[PDB]
CSV table of C-alpha atoms in Angstrom, one decimal:
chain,number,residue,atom,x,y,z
K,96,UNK,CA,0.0,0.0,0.0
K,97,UNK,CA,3.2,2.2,0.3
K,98,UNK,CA,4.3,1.2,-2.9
K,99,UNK,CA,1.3,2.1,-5.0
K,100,UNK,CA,0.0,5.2,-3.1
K,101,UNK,CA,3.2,7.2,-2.9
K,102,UNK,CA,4.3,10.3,-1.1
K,103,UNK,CA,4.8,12.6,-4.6
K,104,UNK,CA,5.4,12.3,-8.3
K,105,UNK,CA,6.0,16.1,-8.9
K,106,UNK,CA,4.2,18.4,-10.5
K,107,UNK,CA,4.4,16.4,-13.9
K,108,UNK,CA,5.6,14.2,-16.3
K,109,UNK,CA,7.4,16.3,-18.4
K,110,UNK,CA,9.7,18.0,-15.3
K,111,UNK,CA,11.1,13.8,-15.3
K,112,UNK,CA,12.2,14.6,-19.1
K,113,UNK,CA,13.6,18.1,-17.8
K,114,UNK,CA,15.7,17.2,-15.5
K,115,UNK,CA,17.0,14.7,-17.8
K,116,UNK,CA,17.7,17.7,-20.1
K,117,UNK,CA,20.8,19.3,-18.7
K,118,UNK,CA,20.7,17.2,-15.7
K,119,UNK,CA,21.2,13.8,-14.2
K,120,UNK,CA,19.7,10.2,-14.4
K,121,UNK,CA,16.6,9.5,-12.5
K,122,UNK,CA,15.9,8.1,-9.3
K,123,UNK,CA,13.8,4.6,-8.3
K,124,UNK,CA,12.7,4.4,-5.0
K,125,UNK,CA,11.2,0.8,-4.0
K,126,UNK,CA,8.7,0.7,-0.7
K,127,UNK,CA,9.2,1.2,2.5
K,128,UNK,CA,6.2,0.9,5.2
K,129,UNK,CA,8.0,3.0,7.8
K,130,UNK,CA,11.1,4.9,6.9
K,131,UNK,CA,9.7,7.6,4.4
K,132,UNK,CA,8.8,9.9,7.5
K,133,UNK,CA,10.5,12.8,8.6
K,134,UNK,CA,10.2,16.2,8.5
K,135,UNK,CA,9.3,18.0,5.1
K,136,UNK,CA,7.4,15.1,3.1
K,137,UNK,CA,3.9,15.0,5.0
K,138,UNK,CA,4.6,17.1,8.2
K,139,UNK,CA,3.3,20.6,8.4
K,140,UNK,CA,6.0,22.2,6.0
K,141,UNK,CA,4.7,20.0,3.1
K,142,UNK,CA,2.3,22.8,2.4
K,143,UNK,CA,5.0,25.0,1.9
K,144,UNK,CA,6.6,22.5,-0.6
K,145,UNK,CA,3.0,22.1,-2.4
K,146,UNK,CA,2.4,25.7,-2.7
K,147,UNK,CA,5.6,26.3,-4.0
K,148,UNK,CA,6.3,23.1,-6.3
K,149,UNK,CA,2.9,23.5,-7.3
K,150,UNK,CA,1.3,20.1,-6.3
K,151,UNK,CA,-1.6,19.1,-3.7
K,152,UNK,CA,-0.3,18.2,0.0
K,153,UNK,CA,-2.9,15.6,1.0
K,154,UNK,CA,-2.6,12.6,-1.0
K,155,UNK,CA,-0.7,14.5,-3.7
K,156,UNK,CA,-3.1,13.6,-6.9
K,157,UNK,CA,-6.2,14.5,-5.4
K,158,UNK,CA,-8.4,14.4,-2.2
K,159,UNK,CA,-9.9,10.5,-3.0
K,160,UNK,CA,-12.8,9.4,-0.3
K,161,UNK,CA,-15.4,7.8,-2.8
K,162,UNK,CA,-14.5,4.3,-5.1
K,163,UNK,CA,-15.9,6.0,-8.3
K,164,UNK,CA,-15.8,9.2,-10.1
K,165,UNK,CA,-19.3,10.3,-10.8
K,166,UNK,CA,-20.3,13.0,-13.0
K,167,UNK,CA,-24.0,12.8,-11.4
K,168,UNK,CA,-23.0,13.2,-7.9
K,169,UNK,CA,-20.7,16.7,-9.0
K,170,UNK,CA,-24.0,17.7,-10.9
K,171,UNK,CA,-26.1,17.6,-7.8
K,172,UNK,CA,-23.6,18.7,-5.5
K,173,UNK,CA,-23.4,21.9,-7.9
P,200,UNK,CA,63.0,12.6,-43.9
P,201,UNK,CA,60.0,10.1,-43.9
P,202,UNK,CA,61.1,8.7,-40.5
P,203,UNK,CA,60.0,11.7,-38.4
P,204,UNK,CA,56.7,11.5,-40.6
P,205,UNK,CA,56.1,8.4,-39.2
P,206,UNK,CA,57.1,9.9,-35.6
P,207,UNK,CA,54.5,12.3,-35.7
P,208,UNK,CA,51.4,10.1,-37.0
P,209,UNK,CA,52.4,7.4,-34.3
P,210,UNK,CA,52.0,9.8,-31.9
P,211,UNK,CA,48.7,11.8,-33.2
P,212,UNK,CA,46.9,8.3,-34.2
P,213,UNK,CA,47.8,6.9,-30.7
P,214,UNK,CA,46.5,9.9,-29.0
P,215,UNK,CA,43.4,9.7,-30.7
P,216,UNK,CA,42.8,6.4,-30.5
P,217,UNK,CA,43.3,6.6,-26.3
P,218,UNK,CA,40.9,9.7,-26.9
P,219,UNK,CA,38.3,7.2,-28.5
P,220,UNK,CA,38.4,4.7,-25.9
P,221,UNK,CA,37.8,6.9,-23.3
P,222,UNK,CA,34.8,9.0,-25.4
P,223,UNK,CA,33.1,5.8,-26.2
P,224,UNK,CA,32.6,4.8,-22.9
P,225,UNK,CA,31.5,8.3,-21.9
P,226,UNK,CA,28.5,8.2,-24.4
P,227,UNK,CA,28.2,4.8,-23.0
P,228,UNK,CA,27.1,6.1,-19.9
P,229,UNK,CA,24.8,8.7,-21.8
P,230,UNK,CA,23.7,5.4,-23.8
P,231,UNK,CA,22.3,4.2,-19.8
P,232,UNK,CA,20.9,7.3,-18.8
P,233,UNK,CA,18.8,8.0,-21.4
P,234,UNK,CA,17.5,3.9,-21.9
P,235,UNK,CA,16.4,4.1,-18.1
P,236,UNK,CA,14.3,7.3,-19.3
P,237,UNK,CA,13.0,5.3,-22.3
P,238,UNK,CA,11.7,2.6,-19.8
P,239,UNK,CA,10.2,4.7,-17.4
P,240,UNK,CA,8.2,7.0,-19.6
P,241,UNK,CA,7.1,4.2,-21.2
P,242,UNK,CA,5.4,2.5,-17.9
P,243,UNK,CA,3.2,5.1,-16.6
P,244,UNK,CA,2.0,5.6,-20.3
P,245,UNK,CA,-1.2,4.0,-18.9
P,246,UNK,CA,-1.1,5.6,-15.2
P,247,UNK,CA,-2.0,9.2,-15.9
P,248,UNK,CA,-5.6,10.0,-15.5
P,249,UNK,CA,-7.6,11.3,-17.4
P,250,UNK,CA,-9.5,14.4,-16.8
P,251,UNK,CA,-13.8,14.4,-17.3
P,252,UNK,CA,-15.4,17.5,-17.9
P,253,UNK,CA,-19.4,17.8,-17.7
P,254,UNK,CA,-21.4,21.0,-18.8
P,255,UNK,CA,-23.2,23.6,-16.0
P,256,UNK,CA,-26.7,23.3,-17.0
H,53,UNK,CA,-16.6,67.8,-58.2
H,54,UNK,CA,-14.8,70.4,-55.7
H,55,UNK,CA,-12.1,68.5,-54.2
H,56,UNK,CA,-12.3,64.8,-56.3
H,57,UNK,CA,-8.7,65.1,-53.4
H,58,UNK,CA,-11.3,64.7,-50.5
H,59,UNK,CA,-13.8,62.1,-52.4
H,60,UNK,CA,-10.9,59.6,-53.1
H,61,UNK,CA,-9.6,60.3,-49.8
H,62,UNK,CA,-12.6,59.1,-48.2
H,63,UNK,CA,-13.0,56.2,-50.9
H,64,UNK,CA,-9.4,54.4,-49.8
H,65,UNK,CA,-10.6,55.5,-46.7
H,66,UNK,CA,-13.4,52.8,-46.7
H,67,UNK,CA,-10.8,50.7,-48.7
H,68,UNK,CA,-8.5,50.7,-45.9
H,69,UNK,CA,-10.9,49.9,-43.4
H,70,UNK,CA,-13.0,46.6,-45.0
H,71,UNK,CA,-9.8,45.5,-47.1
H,72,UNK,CA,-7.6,45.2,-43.1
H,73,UNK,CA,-10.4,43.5,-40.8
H,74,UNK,CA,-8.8,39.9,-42.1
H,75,UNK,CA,-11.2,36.9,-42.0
H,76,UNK,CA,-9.6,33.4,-41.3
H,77,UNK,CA,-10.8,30.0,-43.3
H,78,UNK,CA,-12.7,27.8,-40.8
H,79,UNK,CA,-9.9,25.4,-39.6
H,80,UNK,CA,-9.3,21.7,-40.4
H,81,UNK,CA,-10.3,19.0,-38.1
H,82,UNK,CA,-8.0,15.5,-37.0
H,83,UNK,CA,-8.0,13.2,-39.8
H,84,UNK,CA,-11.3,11.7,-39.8
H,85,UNK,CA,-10.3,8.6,-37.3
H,86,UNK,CA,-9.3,10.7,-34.1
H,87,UNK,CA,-9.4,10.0,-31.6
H,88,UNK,CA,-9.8,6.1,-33.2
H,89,UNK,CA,-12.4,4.1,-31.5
H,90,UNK,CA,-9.7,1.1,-30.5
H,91,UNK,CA,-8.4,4.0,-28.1
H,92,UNK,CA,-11.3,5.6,-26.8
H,93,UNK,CA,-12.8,2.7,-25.3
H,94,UNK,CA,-9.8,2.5,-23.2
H,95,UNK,CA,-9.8,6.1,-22.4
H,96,UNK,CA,-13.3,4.9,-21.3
H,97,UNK,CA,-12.1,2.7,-19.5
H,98,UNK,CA,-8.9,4.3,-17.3
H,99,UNK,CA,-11.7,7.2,-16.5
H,100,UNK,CA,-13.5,4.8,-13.9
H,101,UNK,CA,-16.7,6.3,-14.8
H,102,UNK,CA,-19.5,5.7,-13.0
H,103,UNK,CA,-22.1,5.4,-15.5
H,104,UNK,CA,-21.7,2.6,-18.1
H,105,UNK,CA,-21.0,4.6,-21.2
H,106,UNK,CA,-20.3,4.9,-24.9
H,107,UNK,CA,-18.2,6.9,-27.5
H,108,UNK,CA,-20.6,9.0,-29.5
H,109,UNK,CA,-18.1,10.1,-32.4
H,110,UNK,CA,-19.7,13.7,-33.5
H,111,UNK,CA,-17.0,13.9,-36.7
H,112,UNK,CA,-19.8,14.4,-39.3
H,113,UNK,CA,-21.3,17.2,-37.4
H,114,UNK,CA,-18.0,19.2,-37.0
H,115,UNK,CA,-17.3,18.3,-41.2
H,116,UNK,CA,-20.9,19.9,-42.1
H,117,UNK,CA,-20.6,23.0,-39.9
H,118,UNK,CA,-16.7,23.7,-41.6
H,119,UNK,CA,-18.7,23.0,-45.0
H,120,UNK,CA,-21.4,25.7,-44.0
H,121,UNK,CA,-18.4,28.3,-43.0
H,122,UNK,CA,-16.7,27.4,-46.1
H,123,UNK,CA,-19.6,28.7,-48.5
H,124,UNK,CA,-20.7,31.7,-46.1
H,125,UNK,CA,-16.3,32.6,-46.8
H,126,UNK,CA,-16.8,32.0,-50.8
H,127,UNK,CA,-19.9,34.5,-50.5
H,128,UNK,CA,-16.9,36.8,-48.8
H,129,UNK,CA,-14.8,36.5,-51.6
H,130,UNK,CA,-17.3,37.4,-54.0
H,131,UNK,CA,-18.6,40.6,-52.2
H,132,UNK,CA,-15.2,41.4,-51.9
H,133,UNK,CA,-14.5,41.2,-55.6
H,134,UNK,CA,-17.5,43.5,-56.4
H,135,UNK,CA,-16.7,45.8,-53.9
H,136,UNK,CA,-13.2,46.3,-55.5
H,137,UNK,CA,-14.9,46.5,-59.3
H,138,UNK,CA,-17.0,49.4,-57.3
H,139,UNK,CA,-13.4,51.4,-56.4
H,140,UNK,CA,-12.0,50.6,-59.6
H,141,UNK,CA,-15.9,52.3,-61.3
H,142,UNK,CA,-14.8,55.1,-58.5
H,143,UNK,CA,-11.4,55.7,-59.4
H,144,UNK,CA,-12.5,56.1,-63.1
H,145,UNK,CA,-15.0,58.6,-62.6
H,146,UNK,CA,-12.4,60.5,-59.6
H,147,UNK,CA,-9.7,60.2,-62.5
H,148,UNK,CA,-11.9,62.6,-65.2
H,149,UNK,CA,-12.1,65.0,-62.8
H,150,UNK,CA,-8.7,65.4,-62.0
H,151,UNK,CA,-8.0,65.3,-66.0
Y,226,UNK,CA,-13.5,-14.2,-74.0
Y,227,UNK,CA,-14.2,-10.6,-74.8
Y,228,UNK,CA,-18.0,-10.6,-75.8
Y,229,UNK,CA,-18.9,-12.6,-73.5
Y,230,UNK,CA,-17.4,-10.6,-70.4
Y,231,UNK,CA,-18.9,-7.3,-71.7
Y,232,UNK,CA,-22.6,-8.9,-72.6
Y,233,UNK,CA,-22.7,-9.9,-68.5
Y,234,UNK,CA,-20.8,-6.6,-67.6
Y,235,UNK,CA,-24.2,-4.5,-68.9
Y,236,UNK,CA,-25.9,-7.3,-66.4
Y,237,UNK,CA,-24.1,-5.0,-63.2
Y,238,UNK,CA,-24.2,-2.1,-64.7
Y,239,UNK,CA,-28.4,-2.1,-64.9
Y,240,UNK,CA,-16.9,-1.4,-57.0
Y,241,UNK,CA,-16.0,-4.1,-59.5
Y,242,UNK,CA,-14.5,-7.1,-58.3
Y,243,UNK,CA,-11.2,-6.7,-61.3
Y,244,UNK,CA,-8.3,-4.5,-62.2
Y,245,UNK,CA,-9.2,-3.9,-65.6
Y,246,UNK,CA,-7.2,-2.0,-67.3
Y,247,UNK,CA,-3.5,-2.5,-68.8
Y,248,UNK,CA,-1.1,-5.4,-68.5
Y,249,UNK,CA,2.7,-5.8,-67.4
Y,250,UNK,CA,4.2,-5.8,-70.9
Y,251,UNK,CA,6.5,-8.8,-71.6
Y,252,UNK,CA,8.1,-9.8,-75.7
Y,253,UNK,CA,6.2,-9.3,-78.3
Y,254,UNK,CA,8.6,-9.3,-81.7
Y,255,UNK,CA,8.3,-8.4,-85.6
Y,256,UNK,CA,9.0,-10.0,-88.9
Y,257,UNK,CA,12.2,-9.1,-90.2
Y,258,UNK,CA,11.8,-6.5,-93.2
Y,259,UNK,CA,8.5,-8.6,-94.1
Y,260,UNK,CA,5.5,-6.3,-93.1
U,274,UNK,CA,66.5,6.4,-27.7
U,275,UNK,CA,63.6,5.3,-30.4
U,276,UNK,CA,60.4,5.4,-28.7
U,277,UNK,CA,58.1,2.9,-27.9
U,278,UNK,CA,55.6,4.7,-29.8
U,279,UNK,CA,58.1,4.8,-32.5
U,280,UNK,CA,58.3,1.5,-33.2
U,281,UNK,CA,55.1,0.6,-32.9
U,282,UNK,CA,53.5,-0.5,-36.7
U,283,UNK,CA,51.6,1.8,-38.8
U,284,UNK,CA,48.8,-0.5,-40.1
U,285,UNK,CA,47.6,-1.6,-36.7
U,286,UNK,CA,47.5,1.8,-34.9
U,287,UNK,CA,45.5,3.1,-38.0
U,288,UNK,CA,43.5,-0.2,-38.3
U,289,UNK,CA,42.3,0.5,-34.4
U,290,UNK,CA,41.4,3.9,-35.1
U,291,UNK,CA,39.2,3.5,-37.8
U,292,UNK,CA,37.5,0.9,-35.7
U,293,UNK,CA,37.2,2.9,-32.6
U,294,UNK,CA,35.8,6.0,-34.4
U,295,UNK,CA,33.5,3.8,-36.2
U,296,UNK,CA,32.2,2.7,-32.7
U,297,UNK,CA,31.9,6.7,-32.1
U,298,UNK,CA,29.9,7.4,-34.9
U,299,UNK,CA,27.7,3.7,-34.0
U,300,UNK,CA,27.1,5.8,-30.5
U,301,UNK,CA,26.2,8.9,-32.1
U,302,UNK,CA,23.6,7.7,-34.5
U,303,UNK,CA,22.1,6.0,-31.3
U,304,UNK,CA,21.5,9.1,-29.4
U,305,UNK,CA,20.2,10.4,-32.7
U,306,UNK,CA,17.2,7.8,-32.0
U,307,UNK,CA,16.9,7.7,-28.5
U,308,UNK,CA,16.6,11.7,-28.4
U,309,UNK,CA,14.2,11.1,-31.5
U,310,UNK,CA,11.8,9.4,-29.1
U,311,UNK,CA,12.4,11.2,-26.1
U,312,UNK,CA,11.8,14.5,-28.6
U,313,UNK,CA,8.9,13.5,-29.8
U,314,UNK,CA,7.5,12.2,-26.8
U,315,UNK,CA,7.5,15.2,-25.2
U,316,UNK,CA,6.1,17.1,-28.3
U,317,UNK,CA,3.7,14.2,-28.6
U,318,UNK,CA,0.8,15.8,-26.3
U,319,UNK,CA,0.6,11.9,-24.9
U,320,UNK,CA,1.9,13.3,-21.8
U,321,UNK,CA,-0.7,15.4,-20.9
U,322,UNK,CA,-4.4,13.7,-19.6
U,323,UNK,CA,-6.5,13.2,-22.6
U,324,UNK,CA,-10.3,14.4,-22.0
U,325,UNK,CA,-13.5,12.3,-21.9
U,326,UNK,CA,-17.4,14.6,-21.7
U,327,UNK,CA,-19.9,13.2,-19.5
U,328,UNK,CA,-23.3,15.0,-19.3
V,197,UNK,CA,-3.9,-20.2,-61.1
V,198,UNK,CA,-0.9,-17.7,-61.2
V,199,UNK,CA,-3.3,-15.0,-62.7
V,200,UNK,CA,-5.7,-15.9,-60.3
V,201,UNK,CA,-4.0,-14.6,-57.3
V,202,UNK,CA,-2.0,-12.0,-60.3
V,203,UNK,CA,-4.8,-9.6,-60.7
V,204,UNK,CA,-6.0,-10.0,-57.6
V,205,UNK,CA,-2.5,-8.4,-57.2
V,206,UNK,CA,-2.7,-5.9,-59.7
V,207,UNK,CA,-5.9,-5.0,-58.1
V,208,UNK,CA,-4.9,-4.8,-54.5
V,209,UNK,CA,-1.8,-2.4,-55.7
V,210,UNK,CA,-3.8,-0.4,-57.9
V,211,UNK,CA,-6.5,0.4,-55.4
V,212,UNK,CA,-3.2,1.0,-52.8
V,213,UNK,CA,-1.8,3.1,-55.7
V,214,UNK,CA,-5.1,5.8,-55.5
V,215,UNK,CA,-5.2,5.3,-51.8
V,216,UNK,CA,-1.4,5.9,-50.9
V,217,UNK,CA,-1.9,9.2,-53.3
V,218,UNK,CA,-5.1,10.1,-50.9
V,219,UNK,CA,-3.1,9.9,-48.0
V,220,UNK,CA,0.1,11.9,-49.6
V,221,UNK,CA,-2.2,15.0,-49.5
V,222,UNK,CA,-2.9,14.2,-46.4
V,223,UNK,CA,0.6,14.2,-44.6
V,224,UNK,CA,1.7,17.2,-45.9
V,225,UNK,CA,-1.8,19.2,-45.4
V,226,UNK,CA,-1.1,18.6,-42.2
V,227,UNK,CA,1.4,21.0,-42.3
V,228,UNK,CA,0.4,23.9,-43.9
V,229,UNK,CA,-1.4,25.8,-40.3
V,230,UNK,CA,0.4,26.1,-37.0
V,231,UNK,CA,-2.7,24.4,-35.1
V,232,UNK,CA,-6.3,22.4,-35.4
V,233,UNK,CA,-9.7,22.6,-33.8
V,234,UNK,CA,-11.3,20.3,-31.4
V,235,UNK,CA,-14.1,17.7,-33.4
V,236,UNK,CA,-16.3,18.0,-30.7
V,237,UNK,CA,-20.0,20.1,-31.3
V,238,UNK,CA,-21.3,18.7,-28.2
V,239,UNK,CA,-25.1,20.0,-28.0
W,84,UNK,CA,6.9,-15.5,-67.9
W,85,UNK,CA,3.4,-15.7,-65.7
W,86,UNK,CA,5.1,-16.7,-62.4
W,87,UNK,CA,8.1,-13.4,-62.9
W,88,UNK,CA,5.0,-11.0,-62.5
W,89,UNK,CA,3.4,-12.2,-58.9
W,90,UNK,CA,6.6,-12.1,-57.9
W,91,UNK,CA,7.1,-8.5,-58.9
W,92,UNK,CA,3.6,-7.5,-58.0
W,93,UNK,CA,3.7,-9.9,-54.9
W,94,UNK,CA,7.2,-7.7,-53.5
W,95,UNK,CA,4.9,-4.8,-54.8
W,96,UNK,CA,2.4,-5.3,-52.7
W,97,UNK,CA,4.2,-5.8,-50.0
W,98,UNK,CA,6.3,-2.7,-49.5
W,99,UNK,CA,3.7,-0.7,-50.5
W,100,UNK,CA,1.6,-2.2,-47.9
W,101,UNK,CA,4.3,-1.5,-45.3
W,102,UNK,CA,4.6,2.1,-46.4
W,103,UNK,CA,0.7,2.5,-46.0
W,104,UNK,CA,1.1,1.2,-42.2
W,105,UNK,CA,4.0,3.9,-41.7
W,106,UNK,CA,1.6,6.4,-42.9
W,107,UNK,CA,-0.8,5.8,-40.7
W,108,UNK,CA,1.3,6.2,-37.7
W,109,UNK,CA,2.9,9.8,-38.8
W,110,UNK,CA,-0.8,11.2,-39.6
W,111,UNK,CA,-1.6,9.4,-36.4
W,112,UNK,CA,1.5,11.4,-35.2
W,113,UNK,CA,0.7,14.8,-36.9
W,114,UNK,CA,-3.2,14.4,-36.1
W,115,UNK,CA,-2.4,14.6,-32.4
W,116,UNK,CA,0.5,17.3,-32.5
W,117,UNK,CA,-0.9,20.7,-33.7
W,118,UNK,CA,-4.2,20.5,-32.3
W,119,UNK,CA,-4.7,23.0,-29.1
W,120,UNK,CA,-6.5,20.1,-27.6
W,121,UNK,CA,-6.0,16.3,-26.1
W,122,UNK,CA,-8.1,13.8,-27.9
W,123,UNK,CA,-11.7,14.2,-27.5
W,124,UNK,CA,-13.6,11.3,-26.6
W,125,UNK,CA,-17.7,11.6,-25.8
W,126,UNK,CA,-19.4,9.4,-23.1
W,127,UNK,CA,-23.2,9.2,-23.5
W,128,UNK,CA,-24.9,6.8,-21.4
W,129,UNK,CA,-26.6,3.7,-23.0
């Protein structure tokens, strides 16, 4: 469950091709269950990193509570 | 006078050819960096999601 | 017939100002196929809709609405060429009086 | 051959299946200084 | 003193060459394709989350 | 036998002859503009 | 002389048919660069 729902993939897809351009390689990762802690990936100055790299801080995609993405229930809830 | 002819393209063709080694496995390494992006952009070409948009009225 | 100056100065006046507003060509669409059924069932499919659904292609439409803009553009071009065999009639009868 | 493939070709004609058409040429020779 | 260098022959030195820069151009024309794909890839609009209309 | 499958041959290059030529204009109209509309009307 | 020709025309065929396979990936390529949108897919219900 730590290996599919990470902590955060960056803004993008194309930042991972520009920092191969005039860069370095790239990095791989693997899971760890405890061990990706710490300060400054999901404590309080997170938000600071989101706002400024541009990404969400909770659950970096999105906000996900609900198993299916329904156009009707965003219709009603409008 | 062709002696030292051969004294100098010993020495150039040498130099290159110690130049050539050391070049090709330099783009060798370039050769790996770029073939791990090749196989990771290639994966999540079926993890991005894809955005739904639905009109207001 | 007092200053044909001012009357021809008003006529390319006019010119000026119809002749400059440009008018684009409606624009081409994807190659018919786009976005190719085979690949929007999967986009479909990686969506996690909730509602079962299916890919209503709307090419045609998009085709007949460029064909309509297409003829309302050719009726353009010919009000533009009578407007500039109107100048030219102009500039004939501006040119006798400054003879 | 020939009258009997157009009399039948009126028949579809009251997207054909064939190429018809030319051929790929191959040796077709003369008489020497006779005609 | 003659060098070792010197001494050395002409034909294998140059033979070796050849055959290195060969392998230098092999490399070259390999970057040509892998920054062809990684070019295009990026120019492709494929990474960028195609869009689907619900009603 | 050999004519058999021969102008089915000639037939299926022909046909890819005027289709090929359809499609020539087609790779390089794509050119010719800087960018395309959407084929969506919705409504 | 009838067995030279299909394998001319079967080579023809071929190559040709490779070509038209190419050409449908580099209009699929230029169909999806040089549009200001991602493909555009429409999702009715049933």
């Amino acid at each position: 469950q730590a290996e599919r729902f990470p902590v955060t993939r960056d803004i993008s897809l194309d930042v991972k091709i520009d920092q191969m351009k005039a860069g370095l390689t790239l990095t791989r990762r693997l899971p760890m269950v405890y061990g990706t802690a710490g300060m400054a990936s999901h404590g309080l100055n997170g938000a600071i990193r989101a706002s400024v790299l541009g990404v969400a801080y909770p659950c970096h995609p999105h906000c996900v509570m609900s198993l299916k993405r329904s156009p009707t229930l965003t219709t009603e809830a409008a | 006078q062709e002696l030292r002819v051969s004294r100098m393209s010993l020495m150039q063709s040498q130099s290159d050819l110690l130049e050539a080694q050391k070049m090709v496995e330099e783009q060798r390494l370039e050769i790996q960096r770029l073939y791990k992006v090749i196989e990771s952009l290639n994966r999540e070409k079926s993890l991005v999601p894809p955005v739904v948009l639905a009109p207001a009225n | 017939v007092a200053n044909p100056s001012d009357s021809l100065m008003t006529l390319a006046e006019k010119c000026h100002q119809k002749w400059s507003q440009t008018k684009n060509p409606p624009a081409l669409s994807p190659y018919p196929p786009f976005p190719a059924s085979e690949e929007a069932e999967a986009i479909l499919q990686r969506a996690n809709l909730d509602y079962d659904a299916v890919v209503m292609d709307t090419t045609g439409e998009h085709l007949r609405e460029t064909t309509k803009t297409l003829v309302q553009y050719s009726q353009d071009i010919l009000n533009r060429d009578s407007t500039i065999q109107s100048v030219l009639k102009s500039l004939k009868a501006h040119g006798h009086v400054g003879n | 051959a020939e009258i009997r493939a157009e009399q039948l070709a009126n028949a579809l004609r009251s997207d054909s299946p064939v190429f018809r058409g030319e051929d790929v040429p191959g040796p077709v020779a003369v008489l020497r200084d006779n005609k």
